[PDB]
Design a protein that fits this description.
Length: about 80
C-alpha cells in the first residue's frame, strides 16, 4: 500500500522512511523494488540504467521511452 516514503535530510539527503512502523532507511527495500517491477510487467514496461546511472524505463512492444514509472491507477 504505502509503507515507505521519500524524504529529504537536513542537508537534502534522499532517504526512504517507513511511516507504518515509523522506521528510517536509505536503501530501497526489496518489497519497494518488487512492486514497481510488478506494475511494469502488467503493461509491458522494463527498467534499466544508463552509463550516467540514469534510470530509464522502456516498452519493447511499442518502443516507448519514459524517464519514470508511468502512473498506474487502481486497476
Amino acid at each position: 500500500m504505502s509503507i515507505w516514503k521519500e524524504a529529504k535530510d537536513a542537508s537534502g539527503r534522499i532517504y526512504y522512511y517507513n511511516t507504518l512502523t515509523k522506521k528510517s532507511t536509505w536503501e530501497k527495500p526489496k518489497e519497494l523494488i518488487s512492486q514497481e517491477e510488478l506494475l511494469l510487467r502488467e503493461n509491458g514496461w522494463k527498467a534499466a540504467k544508463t552509463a550516467d546511472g540514469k534510470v530509464y524505463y522502456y516498452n519493447p512492444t511499442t518502443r516507448e521511452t519514459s524517464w519514470t514509472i508511468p502512473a498506474f491507477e487502481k486497476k
